[PDB]
Amino acid sequence: ATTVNGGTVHFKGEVVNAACAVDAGSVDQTVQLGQVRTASLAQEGATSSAVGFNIQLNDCDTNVASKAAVAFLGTAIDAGHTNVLALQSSAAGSATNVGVQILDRTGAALTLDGATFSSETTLNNGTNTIPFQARYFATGAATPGAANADATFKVQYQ
Amino acid sequence: ATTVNGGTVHFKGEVVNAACAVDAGSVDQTVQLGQVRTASLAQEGATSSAVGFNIQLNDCDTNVASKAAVAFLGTAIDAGHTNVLALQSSAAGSATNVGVQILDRTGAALTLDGATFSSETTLNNGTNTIPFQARYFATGAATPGAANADATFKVQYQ
Amino acid sequence: ATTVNGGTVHFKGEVVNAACAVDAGSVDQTVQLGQVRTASLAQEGATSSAVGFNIQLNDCDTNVASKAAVAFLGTAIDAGHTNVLALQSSAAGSATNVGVQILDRTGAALTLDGATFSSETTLNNGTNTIPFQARYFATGAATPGAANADATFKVQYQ
Amino acid sequence: ATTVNGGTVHFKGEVVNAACAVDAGSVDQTVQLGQVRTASLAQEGATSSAVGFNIQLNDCDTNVASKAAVAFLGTAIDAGHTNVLALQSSAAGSATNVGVQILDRTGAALTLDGATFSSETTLNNGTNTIPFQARYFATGAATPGAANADATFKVQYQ
Amino acid sequence: ATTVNGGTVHFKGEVVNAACAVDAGSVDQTVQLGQVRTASLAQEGATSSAVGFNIQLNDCDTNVASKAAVAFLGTAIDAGHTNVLALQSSAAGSATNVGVQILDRTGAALTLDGATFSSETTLNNGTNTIPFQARYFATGAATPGAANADATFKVQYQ
Amino acid sequence: TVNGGTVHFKGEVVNAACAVDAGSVDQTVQLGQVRTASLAQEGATSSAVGFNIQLNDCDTNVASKAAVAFLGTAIDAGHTNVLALQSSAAGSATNVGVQILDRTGAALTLDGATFSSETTLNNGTNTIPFQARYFATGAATPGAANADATFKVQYQ
Amino acid sequence: DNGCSVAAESTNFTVDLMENAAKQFNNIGATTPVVPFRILLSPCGNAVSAVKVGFTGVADSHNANLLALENTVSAASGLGIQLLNEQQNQIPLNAPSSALSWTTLTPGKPNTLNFYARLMATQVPVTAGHINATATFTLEYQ
Lengths: 158, 158, 158, 158, 158, 156, 142
Hints:
- The complex is a heteroheptamer, with six copies of chain A and one copy of chain G (142 residues).
- Chain A is mostly beta strands and 158 residues long.
- Chain A has one helix and 13 strands, in the order ββαβββββββββββ.
- Chain G has one domain: Fimbrial-type adhesion domain (Immunoglobulin-like, Sandwich), CATH 2.60.40.
- Helix content of chain G is 3%, strand content 44%.
- Chain G has one helix at 8-11, and strands at 4-6, 12-21, 35-44, 50-56, 79-84, 103-104, 111-121, 129-141.
- In chain G, the strands form two sheets. Chain G has a four-stranded antiparallel sheet. A three-stranded antiparallel sheet of chain G has the order 6-4-8, with no helix packed on it.
- Chain F: GO terms for molecular function: identical protein binding.
């Protein structure tokens, strides 16, 4: 009977010529690092506790590539810290002298350039979960404020 | 004391004469299908897995209409495949020989002409959820690239 | 003395004119089916073992309604099998020729149309528990992959 | 080797002599009200449900100002209804006898003239969030059509 | 060998100058109130049962502050009921004459003002948990609908 | 009626490795709102807002790395990396300018020829991150702080 | 005096469209970032009120509203120069004087009129090469 205007739906995806495919819940995810005290980040090199996230690969094939690595691209805090990611919340109220650091399964910080790939993990025929961690890193004496960032990643199969 | 120009708020909505009102999250949604390999889409009629989404209708009255059906409208990928939706061509680097296919609650693909309503779902007073799905359909041998798409739906109450 | 901001709390609920109220843990629950060998799902009609889940109804009044039934709604695997729920997961790495069947108190699979209701269970004042089961159903020869699915239920009181 | 023209980027912002700074996501925001029924808005004074939108104030210094208020400005639907906001004109057809009514944290409508500020909210140091609600208000018997609106707001710091 | 685009990751957090840090699971949490019946909320001032939610503070230093209190901010329902939260889901299909109400560790309703703090809880070094409850308060004869409400809290240290 | 004059047009269509996304060719970056207390002295910078230039249909057999060079109006001599603000009818902020950083956190020179750090490319979709701040050349003044800068992509 | 004079700078000037990615023209109608150019009208009298600026030249075969490109051995094909206005609205080539849009001026002062130019694909894929083109601008005074 009555026909209504309804609404709209947008589909977001990508087709890749690769051994695996990145999961729908992993292509875009939000990681809640929580909240950190300025006392925990009080001097150069101080790190907070790490919140663990992971990237899921579906439809993997070991006859095409038996190992996978992930490379991260983002804005470094400065030229002296190429593995720390700057905070880009807004133009006011962001924290100072602190940036998010990303660690692979080896517990080592990753360079944010898109060309330094992490430690290669062996794949299964099927679902594979690659674990990562994210913490806060003080490039000085941290100050109160919002601490949000954003980084892109790419996957290399060998 | 100090009055400062803050900003602007834009309110978007629609008054409709119907039995139900589409939810604020369903009138405009962004479903993320995720990545898919070209091996799964290497031949005509090859379909990837189907991600699930749903449309929520609030304030339903069964004294004026006890069933609902949803019809989607979009750009068909070609004349032959009228139920396969074309990919956004507003930019370069899009996947070829592949489109997105919307499935009703019966599991069958829906013709995207705006006048073919899906299977009727019985309604109850209150909140109603109608489940749909979206997958990838290969009209040939797929090639890598972005696979975003878009559709607009209308609701019929009986 | 020192006031900071903590975060956000979102409350989700529903007010219903009924005889029983669905429990807070039953309005949204995750069922862990486990994993099944593809040898068990070798041909069409092959079924796996069943896990059990319950819907709990609180604050029941037998002076309003003495019996309760539950109907499920979801996307069927195909037109032939209307009682077999279709796997959703992501757009890659999902099991082929496999769905999930929901069985009611009597051990009979329920069609997922939203209007076919299960066997009525007699209600008592207070707390009632309606048991259901979930298993896998092979529409062909199963293939490895994720086997997640979703459905939404609806309660009728008589 | 191949320098190609890329395009342009426009940066929008504002420097203010205030005790707080309106968030980047709050300076211009889009509140999706959803859909409403003509039956729900059938007489003068009949109001729909309310959606919630928040105004965030980053980098707040309480030594400068301890409380904040927000005053909205927009075109009124009639002279009699000064707290109701007129809808924009639409090519397909806009709804009549209905507007948008903004409520503050006390659940009271706000006069949309730019001089009547809402109830004062106590601010902390740093991130602050002021909740508001948008609601449909029927000035008569509402008719179907798109119901879009816009309102500019200013912030006062005591 | 094969390098493909993976996607993006968003990191969210905040650096605070406080004795404790709000947990990653507490900075943004969802409480499932369940379903309630209009028969229960059939009169003004009639309440429902209460569900419990906790706010967890990490890395607490009792030398800095020995007590903590929490204040909640949100849209009230009426001028008379300042401690009852207003429902905000969409522009249609919400319960009428009812709102969420938050209770501190003394079992008393909290004014949703941003300045009336809850009963102080003594803090020990390390992890602390602050209990809270949420129920439904009816400002009249309640009507069926979806009852979702949101609030933001501040934590005061002494 | 008047013959006027002749306008010549020169240019080249080259085989570039990628193509700037239709979103990225013209994008508006909502920096937000800043306080004069934050921008209170020479060299004082506000917090950064991130924006991305997305490239599509990239081919690594044509070019394996990409860089972006920005061109804009400098606020002053000696502040070539600080972009001048546009003028508004009500008024614009003085002693404030938009500053565009790089993927290494270093502000770019808005000359149109000082390219940014080169990012390696993968076949398909690539994304180049950038950030924007408010750089103060003195005591800031309230007002609208809008600016605009063009950019060019060097595939190497 | 309702008539203005074209300065030596605006008598003959070249608009540099720079290098353009052949991949940017995915489909017919794909454009490029606009390149601004200006026409200085000075001196002007105290009676000038409006000027309509029209563009004339050899039009493209596929699109009659696009300025054509010279066909040589090493010239790009499948493209056409789209000339816009101050508000980025299309100004058709060889359009009649009634079809144009009046532009306001300021009497007694050197007035600068700003327009834009870009490339629009008429064929896919767009071939590579150079883009040499000439147009003649005419002025209708009011």
